[model samples]
Each structure stands twice: as C-alpha cells, then as structure tokens.
Target: DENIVVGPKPFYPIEEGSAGTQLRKYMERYAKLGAIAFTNAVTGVDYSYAEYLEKSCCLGKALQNYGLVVDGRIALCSENCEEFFIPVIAGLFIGVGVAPTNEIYTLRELVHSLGISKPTIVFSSKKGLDKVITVQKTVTTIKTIVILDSKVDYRGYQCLDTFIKRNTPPGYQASSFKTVEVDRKEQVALIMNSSGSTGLPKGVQLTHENIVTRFSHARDPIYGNQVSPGTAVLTVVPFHHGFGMFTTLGYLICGFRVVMLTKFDEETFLKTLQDYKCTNVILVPTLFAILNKSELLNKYDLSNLVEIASGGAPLSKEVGEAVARRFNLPGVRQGYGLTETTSAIIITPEGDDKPGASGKVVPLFKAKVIDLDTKKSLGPNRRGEVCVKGPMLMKGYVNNPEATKELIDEEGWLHTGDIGYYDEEKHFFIVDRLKSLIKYKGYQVPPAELESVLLQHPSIFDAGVAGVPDPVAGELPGAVVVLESGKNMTEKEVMDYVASQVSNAKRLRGGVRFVDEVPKGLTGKIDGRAIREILKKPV
Candidate 1:
C-alpha cells in the first residue's frame, strides 16, 4: 500500500460533454435540493436554482443579441457577486470563452489584458467602471460594455437589467433555449492569465473538457465526497482565480448551497459561516494566518464546518497545526495546483490528511519530480521541480506557441515551476517556487513586471526584484535598485511610484533598498537568487 500511489476512487461517473451541458443536467437533477443555490453575503442577494437557470438563459440570449458570435471572448471585470456567475454561465451557453479579469488590476494592467484577450463584450461593476472606460478608449476591439450592478445606469453603458430585457426575444422562455453544441475537447472555455517563468502575463487557455474533467475528478473519493445535496460552502476566494471559479461550479453541480463573499474579512467571514452554517470552505494560507491570530473566532459557532481546504500558496506547518488545533479539526488539509492545471490536481484524501505534505495526485493525473540541474527524475524524499500530465491540463497559452511549447513538453508533461517532492506514501510536499513571482497573500506578483515598471522611473538606472518571506502574507515583493548619476530618490518615493503604477498586491511592501549595482548571471539577465542573497546580508 505504501509503494502504490493512492489515487481517486470511482464514485459518480462524469459524462463527456461541454460545461454548459453538464451544468444544465445538474441544475435539473438538483433543482429540488435547495431553493437558493448562491448567496451574496455582502449584498444579501440570493439566487435559487430556478432563478439561476432562467437568468443565465436570458443573459445568454442577451449576449447573442449584442452580436457576440460563437467563440467570441467575453471579459468580466468585477468583484465576487451573483452577477459574476451569471455571465460566466451565459458565456458557456453561447459557446464563448469567458475571461474573468482581476478587479484589482490597475489601468495599465487592465489595458494589457484587454489588448491580449481582445474581448468583444466587457462586463464591469460600478467600482470597475473607471478602469473599463480607460480600456474602452485604448482597446478598440471592445464593442459592448455591460455593467454588473443593476442600480447604476452609466451613460452609453448598458446595465444588467436593461441589457437582459432588450436582448430577450418576445415570448422567449428558459425552457425554449438550449445550450449550443460544441466540441468540448477542443473549444476554449476560459482564458485566465498566469505569471509564468517570464514575468509578463500569459493567457492560459482552458477548454470545456478541461473544466468538466476537473469537476468529475473532484467528485472522486481522493478529494473527499464532501459536497452533496444541501451542503453549504462559504467561498471567499475571488471568482477570477481558477480555484474559486471551478470550486463554485463544482459545488453547483453537486447541489451545494454556496455563500459567496466579495472580500475576505475575519469578522464578516466568521459571521457568515455561523449564520449560513457552512460545512466547508476553500481558503489560502494568508487567511489561515489571519484566523490563527483572531480572538473573535471564539464568538462564532463553527461546529458545522467540516473541512478547510487550503491552496493558492503553501501552508506552513506551524500555522496549519495551530489552526487545526484551534478549530478542533483533523488538520488543515493542503491541496496543490496551478492555473495550467485548471484547478487542483493534488488534494488531501477524505481521511488520510497529512500535516505538512500536500495530498496525493488525483486519479487520471501523473506526477514526477525532476532535478533542476540534471533534468533527471528523482525518487521519494528528493526535492526537485514538479511535473504533471493530466486531462485537466490547459490546451496551451493563447496565441503564444513558443511559450506554450516551453511549458508543456512534446510528451505532454507540464512543467510546474514549483519545487516539491513526494514521500514514500506518495504524499507531496512543496518547498519553494522556481519562478520569480511573489505570493503576496495568495496573489501572484511577478517581480519582472515590477522591475520593468521601476526601470521606467527617471531616477532609477537598473532594478531587480525578489520575494521576502513574511509571517502574515506568504511573501512580499522586495526591490534592489541602482540610482542614476547625480540623482537621489528616497525609498518611500520609489515605493509610492510603484504603488501608483501597479495593483496593491504588486506594491513593494517588503521595502526598497538602493544598491550601486545589480548582480547579473552569465547570460546577462538579472540574477534573482543573487539579489536575494544580497538582501540577506547586513543592511
């Protein structure tokens, strides 16, 4: 038993079909389980299964009315809300790829994403209206702009209610509309951006089959058959992220009532959990650290919470153990995956929870650890780069064949830049990331992206960035810069400049240090490891 890698046990069979088809099937089967399928904790708005199906269909027809052709790209830029889920399902019904942009992205980052995705229709809330307006001016490919919030009727912009009503045909009903047929294995369903080896964002193309397979795998026993009819899940993760998007859909497919939170606050989260009696929650390492320090947790009755699945970043052993003990649970079970894998490929088994190690690979997925220098596979207890091959893997990076080839080999193995190893029992443990991206509170902050921005400053001659470990935030972006001749800039000035240019997560929170020269490797590229070592030395 120790020698064999424990994989998922067959439970419910997943049929071969597109995401829209599967969702329709599930909605019909689980219609009677719960009246409310999704609840907005912040707004107190809820959507029953019947209402969800009707709204999604109406929105789908509305999108078609706006001249969104098949295979067209629809971009969603908004915080977590019931409206976010509607357009996502609508895109699936219309056979269009949904690209959920990070609501926190600055103007410059939003421009880059919009230019790359070239979405025909963009959905934004009142909060994101400014950024969307900027994108509309710069990115001419955008033809229609729809606001998620029904309250605001911005001039020249269509609100959700108006758009849906105008688009819904005369006497059109939800039962009359049917999901368009598409090749699930080949049609792109989602276009999410990920920070790869290169700091620039690359669109990770996920197909319908990729997501459907993920949902099926989650139902397997290895990940725990925790989700069922009437199960309540409190989802705080951003819908833009792959982890949140798939988990939300998975819960829906299993007939679970989901409580959606716009943002993560300790008080709000605890109150919602107790009020809703959430049975499970998906969280990041940062939230666990926050929960570990909170005294208010004692006020809430969390007896219904059965599982706390941690992902996005590695959960430290100390924090994991402390939270588990505080909550009186089995353990803070860890799962591992990247955007390239659609969702999690490795998850802690139902009862086989390990303290430090990420769980075994799910069924239909193969994993191996290879030495970075030698490029040879390593056995148990040996740390190296983690490689995986699975049905849930992304099709490729959209419009970037060269980068796609570099990520996935000809043999179909995806090189996950994460450094980790499997144990005797096939339990995986993550050590570090080989990439230069910093994990600031579960958000991916590419050092190169920041460095490029810093170099643009007139006072800066050269710049290099790295991640400095933090207790609360998993990591913070730190920068070492070279000053131009006869030019002086304070650390605060440098930090403020970057903060204004990029999103909050990408800010130089670890503090900036002025250096005379930046270390470079033999290839004349910025040596990130050497920079880390320099930062380690006495200031």
Candidate 2:
C-alpha cells in the first residue's frame, strides 16, 4: 500500500486567477440566481449579490482615493456585520491584502498584531473604536482610521458613509472600476495570525491561489449541493476567524444566504434559527455542548435545519450523538484543519457517519501519519503526527522564515502538530496534540506564554502551564508553581496575576496549585503530559 493518501479529484476545475476574478464569477452567477449573499440578522438588512458587488466597487474606489495601492495591507478589526464584507471584497478587487484582526483582542494584543502587519489603513466598528485609537498611538504605520458604524467624527477619524460619499461621485459606475492585475500564486491575499509551539503569534500568509483552490473544493458537487439555493445559514463564528471567514465566503459562492450574528448567545441563536428559517448551522464543540444543555431548545421551532457542522475543536462522541438525538439530525458532522491550510482539509462526507473520527481527507488534499521518532511515514491505524499537502497550503509565515521552515518541510508537506491516524476506511481520528497550546472556547492560548508570566513573580521558583479538559470551554489553562521556601502565595493571587496580564480567553480559569517541584523531562523541559496529570489529581 502507498504511504500517502490522496483525495478525490476536484469535481470542478480550479481556474488560474486572482480573488478579483473569483468575486466576479460569484457576482455574475449568484446574482442571476436571485440570491441574497449577506444579511445582518440584528438589523434585518439584506444584501443581495448585485447590491454587494456594487457596494464593493464603490468602496474599492474610495480606498484608492485614500492612497491605497496594489499590495497594500488593510487591517479590519470589527465584529460580524454586513459592512465588514465591503472592505474585504474591495481589497481583493484592488489587489490589497486584507488582515482581519480579532475584535475581542485587548489593547496590548492589538498593538502587537498591528506592529507586525503594518497596515496603511485600519477599519473598525463603533464598539472597537477605543482599541483602534490605542493601536494608532503605538503603530505609526497606520495612516488612516475609518469607523464602520458612526457618521459622527471621532478624534478626526472618518466614518465609512462620509468617506464613501466624498470619494465616489453620485454617478459613479461599477463598470468604471478597474481591477489591478495580480499573480495568484505569488500575491498575498490574507494575513492571519496563529500561535505555534513557542513564542508569540506568527502571521500565516495565504495567497489568492490558496483560497481559490479551497473555494473550488468547497463548491464541488460532492459537498456543494447539500445546501440548496435560498437556504439560510446562521453563522455565529467570528468573522476574523479563518473558518468563519472562509465558510461565509464559501456559502455565498454556493448561492446560499448567510445570516450573520455578532456573537453566539443561546437565546438569540435559537430565535434567529427559528425566525430566519436557517437550514444549516456551524459551531464549535463547546457551543454544541451549551446548546444541548439549554432548556429553551424545545421551545423554538427548528424544523427547517437540515444539517449541523462542528469544527474548531474536537467534538466528543457523546456530545455529537447527544446533539443529533436532541435535534433530530441524522448526525453531527465533524471537520478539521488549520489556519495555515486556509480552513477545512478534512470533512465528513455527505452521508458518512463514523463515531469518534474527524472525517475523511477532503478532495484536493493529501495526508499521512508519520512516526514521531523515526520520521517515517506510517500506514493506516498507526498513530503518529498528522501531515498534509495540498494547493491550499499557506505561502509562508510573514517575516519569520525559521518558523515557516519548521512548519512546511522541503518535500512540501505541512507537519500539523496533531497526533492522528486514518482507519482502513480512510476516516481520520485525532488522538492528541503535539503542540502545547490550550484551546479555550476555540481560542488558542499558548502554555509557554502563561508560564513566562508566572516566572516573572519573585516568589515563584519555577512554573508550568497546561490545558485541563473542560466540557464547556474545550480546555482551561491550569498552572502548577514551585514557590520559594519562605515565600507563600495563595492560588487566587496566582490566578489573578495571569488574568490581569493576558486576554480574557487566556486566563487561568482551571485554577492553580502549589507544587514542591515542577516535573521535568531528561531534556530539562517541563513535560506537558506530566503537568496535565498533576492538574487532574486532587489538591
């Protein structure tokens, strides 16, 4: 048997083109089908395909008037709204890179992200105005700040409505908008941040070719036809997240209407599903858990929902089965991928249901399980590190060649820091993670970052941080500390210290415990497995 597992050929051929060309195809095809691309569920505003294309053209022209050129970076930090799609599509048309930063990022986190990408213009909603102001102070590279929601001027920042009106004349024509020429393979389209095994966050550069390839695979007959036209999809995932961004785009490309939610709330989520008649929904494992436990589930009329897709983190067999039973769905479909790979590289097929398995390798992807110590490829059912190779692989890590090399090998295989194996039937199963990052409610929290902060305290001799499994959060950051003989600190004090230093998601919600000696391996590194076991024990 061959060591590599290659997926089925794409049903539709991937054209050689840029994001602008792809957008044009979607606009022409979907507009003719009379499909609504986006809707702000809160405000009850719907943007049809024709309207979305026209608005993007007007906004792209406005961005050009504001000194944006080909290859320029535009940072968008905002929640989910109909207006957010304008800047993203406009950037693609103008050959500018779009960097969508997480809206919940604190001031310190925002500064670091802006410093790396160095966008010429920044966009935010009224809610994120304070963080954008603080980011402007530190990141001098930012020349203009445009607020998305408000028309009133704030500290000389221009609003989106005023800016567009001033730049685009009343008689502006969509035909007059010229799209810049872009080499799909070489030009960077998006810069997304992802944490690795060590150090701060690194930017993953995704080219137009990478995204377009994934988009084509998503539209293949095997997966695309599942959701019919006029189907409404309730999207609760953040727009800044890779899965959320791609899925929203993919659904629109497939001619399905999308209902955007700023954030996930049990009550609002159910209401939207019932009111909008959304036929499809995607959520993380933790959200599924919350939905299963909610008492209001039976009160809402959700007979229209046809399918449920879960990703971002592992969904346990018990939870998946429970969700299917509660909602009367055939089964809960699970998918897996990384930011470096655009989005999902593996997904459960339309009719396949395998317990405890992530899914089969999606079309256009190649995967293998390699032995950890020998670095040799293994056969099916042999557990090892999972590796993937495909056209959707990222271009590289921005400004970090060493880290890029560590991720993508010379053979073009991406070494995903996850331990998994495929069964004889080709269904993949993930066993554990080789990377030391805690996934709290789908947000990646690096354990080393928490350990470094704990070491800053003078009373702590040594410290180690690891993830403790939690049904609601997926994982909680837990710390074990070794204090000086004379110095003593309560667990609450230790937890409070880390909470104040990091963002809300990175807080040590699993609590902390004092240990006489932090466990170490022969290589003088804190063994994460040992720390997990220690955190599981009774205090």
Candidate 3:
C-alpha cells in the first residue's frame, strides 16, 4: 500500500553549506589552477576563472557601496552572454536573492514578475531598457536601474562596467573580500517564475540549501566533471529559466567549461558544437525537436558529443530515438521537474533510454502516484497524479502562502499536477498534465501525444494541439501545424494521418490548420491557449 519510491544513495555526497561559501571554495581552487572557465561565442572573448572572480568581487563591492546588502535584491533580464553571470554571482556573495525575468516579456508581464520579487536594482540590456524603465515606474521597490550592455539615452542609468568603476565600494579590497554567510536553509538565493500555464505566474524562491543540495545527487559526468583542459559545454538555453540558472552555476563550480551563445542560429549552433569539440550539451525538448528536423546538423562533425539531456517538458520518444540514430550516440535523455523543485526531480539514468519514461527518482527524494478522482495512492502501471517529497522543494511562492498550500499538502508532498505512472522497476513516466489534457467526449486526449505523431510526418516541421470547444462533443481535438519550408500538405490529409495513428477518441475531429509558425515560449514549450486563440481567428 505504501508506494513511496526512494532513490539510491547519493552519487556525490551532499556538499553542505551556503552556496556562496562553496562557490568561493571552488572558484579559488580553479582560479589558482588557471582554468579557462567561460567563453562568449558571439564576442569571441575568453574569461579565465581568475577574471570571473575579479569581476564578481568588484560587482559585489559595487552592490555593497549602493547599500544593496541589507535584505535587498537585484533583477536581471537579457539574452545569454558573458556579462549575465557577474550580477548573479555578485548578488549571491552579498546574500541578495537574484531575480531573472524573460528577455522577451512585454510590459504587463514584466510588471507582475518584477513587482512581486520587489527588486531594489534592475539590470537590463539596451533592448529591454524601455520596458525596464516602465517597470521601474510602477514597481516602487526599484530605486536604481543599471544597464548590462552599452549605454543609450542615459536616464539615471549607468552601464555595469562604469557603475562598478565610479562606485567600487568605499575602501573596497577585492583580495580580502569574504562571502557573507547566512542560514543556508533559510536564505533565498534564486527567485524564479513558475510556468504560469493556468494563470498569472508566481515567484518560486530557491533557498541556498535548496541549490546546494540539488547537485549533491545528480551529476552527469558527460556534461560536468569533464572540466579538464580541453572539454566544454555549449549553453544556448535562456539563463533566466531554472534549468539554465542552476545548470550554468552547477557546471561552473565543477570547473566545467561553458560557452554561451546569445541567440540560436543553425549555423552558429552547429559551428560552435563542432569548433569547440563540445562534449555535452544541456537543452530543453523544443531544441531537440528542432534538431531532429535539422538540415544543418549533418554538415558538422559532432562525434565529440558524449551526452545530451533535455528537460522542461516531456520529450517525444519518436524525436529522441531519431536523434540518437542520426548522431550515432545514445538516445536523447529526458527528465521531469519544475521551478518549484528547483529543477529536475527525476532524470533518465545513464544508459536507461526507456521509452516514454522520465526516469528514476533522485537521491534523497521519494515519489508516488495517486488516483486523481480517489485521491488515494496507486502502485506501478497505474496512471494518476504524481507527488514527490524532497529536501530541495521550494520554500514557497514568494508572498503567496495560499497558493503554496494548494501545491504541497500537509504531508509535505508536492502535488506535481502531472498524470504519470511508474513501472515495476520504479521508473516514472509523465503521460500528461492534469490541466493540459483535452477531454474529447468523456475521453482524455494528450496534446503531446498527437504533436509527437505529427512530428513523425514527412512534411510537418512543427505542431501544436489544443482542445476545440464543442456543443455535442464537449471538446474536440484540433491541431496547428507548421509545414517544412516550401513543403505543402492539405489540412484534411494532415488530420487523417494523425487519426489513423491514434485511437478514435484522440483523433483530430475539430480539424487541422497550417501556419508558418507555431506559438511557443522562449523555452520552446507550445502555448496551447495561444494556439486556441489562433484557432479562433478566421479559419
């Protein structure tokens, strides 16, 4: 009756303590070793571990000079670059929770995010300044604004470099600056946003212990720990997301070389992978889906790659296998977690590659599945809502206790809101989200299922599925398809192809429509509601 599945002993013993102290411990060791820590592909600039420490120390001094050391926070919004990590690392050293928002958010989206975190200082690129200025106007907590890149139309704003130079803290000495220690379990480190699929996003706060414990269990020797002289990992994923933030930091402290790209272009992506002889990459499912259909991948030699992992969403089995076959490597590994969990709770263990399964639970964590209707725990092969209990679970959504209670029950279990099942071997498979399911005439249909099937089609470049409201059927399954460039396919034929592959209830009854682009977020997860809105628009 007890279905709580526990993970194995810690692969790497918990490196306990504050994130800043541990970070400093490794930064010092690696800097003394003269390690090449990071490279900016867009700018062709290389930063040794030595430079990284110097910059972070100076920025910390700057923040301290501005009196941002007392219960204060700073927010960062920008594309991935060499400069993005300094503000983040600096904030940690001074015990400031660093908040990061999407670079593509509009005005109101910006307000809701930055407003709740209530940042004392805001960092922005030239492009995001207009919105940052407007956000500053509404969010009274923001007293100072600084730009990350080049200065333009200066309105009480200083470029990061100039800001540090002009006010590098009164009598500051970088050589002796120490990392401010705190109660690791109580102090919040990274303030990120929940996916916001249902309504307005809530701020997910990860404490210092939450972060330090995250890497205690899971470490991909392929992407991490390969930080000897000539190994590196290329990161194109947005650093604002929990996956990016933790992964970036997690690797840095391990002495893993990270090469960051500002934007994604097929040529640059493949070229960077080839040129650097990158051994592993951390990515989301969307990039995997696109790469499976890539025309540029074959032009470069990626034999150097040993591991590729995808998270943020359930990766399609069809796409994962195709990539493995094409690249002459093991299948693309999939994992599942949330910002609420500080990132992945379970990842496909090395060499498992089991179809449709997210993977085994991580060390110090336990998981179970419960029937959605009965609210009773279920055993292997029984599909139901997934719940997990773990040490790294978020403290709570910032300033929203009611919402937090709704997620984690009194038993200390986090209601994952996912419909999943575990096999006899205890591997987890997330079938669908409880909120994202489309009910078709009393039968539930998963959008990811149909989308994956569509991806297998010869001409379908990309696809998204959403429920089409119906009077008699209650809801009908519909699809928005993106055809390959210069490729043509009739809507009915697209519908028929999917219909033949899936059962009757899951078939596309509402219809299929072709589009040049499928609506997606920065992370590449499909926007079903956005797709529904597009479906509502003329034909």
Best candidate, TM-score? 3
Which runs in model 2 stand beyond 4 Å of their true positions? Answer: 151-155, 195-198, 224-227, 436-539
Question: Which ten-residue region of model 2 has the weakest summed lDDT?
Answer: 518-527
> Which lDDT tens digits does candidate 2 get at residues 421-521?
99988889865466766889977676756775676566776787888999999999999998865999999999988888888988998889889877653
Question: For each candidate, C-alpha RMSD in Å?
Answer: 10.0, 9.9, 2.1
**How well is each residue in 1-539 modelled by candidate 1, as lDDT tens digits?**
13224355446566766899888878766665545788888777888988887888889888887787789999998877776888889899889999888667767777887788889888898778888888989898888888886655676788987788888887788888888878888999999865322455678889998988877866665574545665788877778778788888888777788888766677988998898888888775546645765688779999898778787765557667777888888897767888899988888777776668888888777888888788678889987888888788998988899989988988788998878888877888876566766889978675656875776576776778888778999888888988867999898999999999889898888888888877642112356776777766656
Q: Give the distance in Å from residue 159's predicted Cα in candidate 2 to where it truly belongs.
A: 1.5
lDDT of 3 by residue, 1-539 (tens): 56879877666666866787777777878888888788887677888888888778888878887787645789997767677788888888889999988668867778999988998888887778888888888897798778886534356678887788877755666778778888888898989975545566688899888888776644544212334566688887788888888888877777877888765667787888888788877787767656776787778989888777778876788888888777777676766788899867887777555776788887778899998898889989999999998878999999999999999999899999888999988989887678778988888888889988998887998898889899998888888998887888887899889878999898888788888888877666778888888777766
What are the clashing pairs of model 2? none
- Please report the TM-score between candidate 2 and the true structure: 0.81
CA lDDT of each candidate?
Answer: 0.78, 0.79, 0.80
The clash number for model 2 is 0
Residue 310's lDDT in candidate 1: 81
TM-score of every model? Answer: 0.80, 0.81, 0.95
Show where candidate 1 strays beyond 4 Å.
1-9, 32-34, 195-198, 436-539
